[PDB]
Protein backbone atom coordinates (compact mmCIF):
# COMPACT_ATOMS: atom_id res chain seq x y z
CA UNK A 1 0.00 0.00 0.00
CA UNK A 2 1.03 3.64 -0.66
CA UNK A 3 2.02 4.38 2.98
CA UNK A 4 2.71 8.15 3.02
CA UNK A 5 3.30 8.62 -0.75
CA UNK A 6 0.99 11.66 -0.52
CA UNK A 7 1.20 13.65 2.75
CA UNK A 8 -0.43 16.67 4.40
CA UNK A 9 1.16 19.85 2.89
CA UNK A 10 -1.05 22.73 4.24
CA UNK A 11 -4.47 23.02 5.96
CA UNK A 12 -6.76 26.05 6.58
CA UNK A 13 -7.13 27.37 10.22
CA UNK A 14 -10.96 26.90 9.96
CA UNK A 15 -10.68 23.94 7.54
CA UNK A 16 -12.07 25.67 4.40
CA UNK A 17 -9.52 23.65 2.35
CA UNK A 18 -6.92 20.85 2.47
CA UNK A 19 -3.59 21.06 0.59
CA UNK A 20 -1.84 17.73 -0.18
CA UNK A 21 1.65 16.97 -1.60
CA UNK A 22 2.96 13.75 -3.23
CA UNK A 23 6.56 13.14 -2.03
CA UNK A 24 6.62 9.88 -4.11
CA UNK A 25 8.82 9.32 -7.25
CA UNK A 26 5.80 8.06 -9.30
CA UNK A 27 2.19 9.07 -10.21
CA UNK A 28 -0.06 8.30 -7.23
CA UNK A 29 -3.36 6.74 -8.47
CA UNK A 30 -5.96 8.76 -6.49
CA UNK A 31 -9.65 7.91 -5.76
CA UNK A 32 -9.88 5.17 -3.11
CA UNK A 33 -7.96 7.75 -0.96
CA UNK A 34 -10.08 9.86 1.47
CA UNK A 35 -9.46 12.87 3.78
CA UNK A 36 -11.22 12.38 7.18
CA UNK A 37 -11.49 15.87 8.75
CA UNK A 38 -13.04 15.07 12.15
CA UNK A 39 -13.96 18.11 14.32
CA UNK A 40 -14.54 17.62 18.11
CA UNK A 41 -17.54 20.04 17.85
CA UNK A 42 -19.39 17.14 16.18
CA UNK A 43 -18.99 17.44 12.37
CA UNK A 44 -16.74 14.64 10.98
CA UNK A 45 -16.54 13.95 7.20
CA UNK A 46 -14.35 11.97 4.75
CA UNK A 47 -13.76 13.40 1.23
CA UNK A 48 -13.35 10.37 -1.07
CA UNK A 49 -11.44 11.30 -4.26
CA UNK A 50 -12.44 10.58 -7.88
CA UNK A 51 -10.80 7.26 -9.24
CA UNK A 52 -10.51 9.08 -12.65
CA UNK A 53 -7.87 11.39 -11.05
CA UNK A 54 -4.14 10.59 -10.65
CA UNK A 55 -1.81 13.02 -8.79
CA UNK A 56 1.77 13.32 -10.16
CA UNK A 57 5.27 12.71 -8.66
CA UNK A 58 6.40 15.84 -6.74
CA UNK A 59 3.05 17.59 -7.43
CA UNK A 60 0.33 18.88 -5.06
CA UNK A 61 -3.52 19.22 -5.09
CA UNK A 62 -5.69 21.74 -3.18
CA UNK A 63 -9.21 20.50 -2.19
CA UNK A 64 -11.37 23.54 -1.24
CA UNK A 65 -15.05 23.71 -0.11
CA UNK A 66 -17.95 24.76 -2.43
CA UNK A 67 -19.07 27.09 0.40
CA UNK A 68 -15.55 28.63 0.39
CA UNK A 69 -16.85 30.84 -2.50
CA UNK A 70 -13.78 29.72 -4.49
CA UNK A 71 -13.51 29.18 -8.28
CA UNK A 72 -13.07 25.43 -9.05
CA UNK A 73 -9.89 25.41 -11.23
CA UNK A 74 -8.91 21.72 -12.08
CA UNK A 75 -6.54 19.90 -11.82
CA UNK A 76 -4.54 22.22 -9.45
CA UNK A 77 -7.56 23.29 -7.34
CA UNK A 78 -10.29 20.65 -6.87
CA UNK A 79 -13.40 21.79 -4.95
CA UNK A 80 -15.69 19.45 -2.95
CA UNK A 81 -18.95 20.56 -4.64
CA UNK A 82 -21.88 20.10 -2.21
CA UNK A 83 -19.80 20.80 0.98
CA UNK A 84 -19.92 24.30 2.56
CA UNK A 85 -17.93 23.90 5.80
CA UNK A 86 -15.38 21.16 4.78
CA UNK A 87 -15.17 20.34 8.54
CA UNK A 88 -15.15 23.80 10.16
CA UNK A 89 -13.89 24.13 13.72
CA UNK A 90 -11.50 25.77 16.21
CA UNK A 91 -9.74 22.34 16.49
CA UNK A 92 -9.92 19.31 14.10
CA UNK A 93 -7.90 16.20 13.08
CA UNK A 94 -7.48 16.20 9.26
CA UNK A 95 -6.51 12.59 8.36
CA UNK A 96 -5.20 11.37 4.96
CA UNK A 97 -6.13 7.72 4.16
CA UNK A 98 -4.81 5.62 1.19
CA UNK A 99 -6.45 3.10 -1.24
CA UNK A 100 -5.89 0.23 1.29
CA UNK A 101 -7.97 2.14 3.88
CA UNK A 102 -4.97 2.83 6.17
CA UNK A 103 -4.44 6.30 7.78
CA UNK A 104 -1.10 7.26 6.08
CA UNK A 105 -1.01 10.89 7.36
CA UNK A 106 -2.82 13.20 9.85
CA UNK A 107 -2.41 16.75 11.26
CA UNK A 108 -4.53 18.29 14.06
CA UNK A 109 -4.93 21.93 12.86
CA UNK A 110 -6.63 24.62 14.97
CA UNK A 111 -7.99 28.17 14.42
CA UNK A 112 -4.83 30.01 15.63
CA UNK A 113 -4.42 31.88 12.28
CA UNK A 114 -2.19 29.48 10.27
CA UNK A 115 -1.98 31.53 7.01
CA UNK A 116 0.69 34.26 7.47
CA UNK A 117 0.90 37.42 5.26
CA UNK A 118 -2.80 36.91 4.26
CA UNK A 119 -3.11 40.73 4.87
CA UNK A 120 -3.90 41.21 1.12
CA UNK A 121 -7.32 39.72 0.21
CATH top class, domain 1-121: mainly beta
Contact criterion met (CB below 8 Å) for 63 and 73: no
Secondary structure (3-state) at 102: coil
CA distance 105 to 81: 24
C-alpha dihedral, 67 to 71 to 72 to 76, nearest 10°: -120
28-66 burial, b if ≥16 CB within 10 A, otherwise e? Answer: bebeebbbbbbbeeeeebebebeeeebbeeebbbbbbbe
CA angle 41, 102, 95 (to 5 degrees): 30
Contact criterion met (CB below 8 Å) for 107 and 11: yes
Contact criterion met (CB below 8 Å) for 99 and 32: yes
Question: Domain limits of the chain?
Answer: 1-121
Residue 21 CA neighbour count, 13 Å, CB half: 6
Amino acid sequence: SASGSVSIEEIDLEGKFVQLKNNSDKDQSLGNWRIKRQVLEGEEIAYKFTPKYILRAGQMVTVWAAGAGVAHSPPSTLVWKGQSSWGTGESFRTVLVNADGEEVAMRTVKKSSVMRENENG
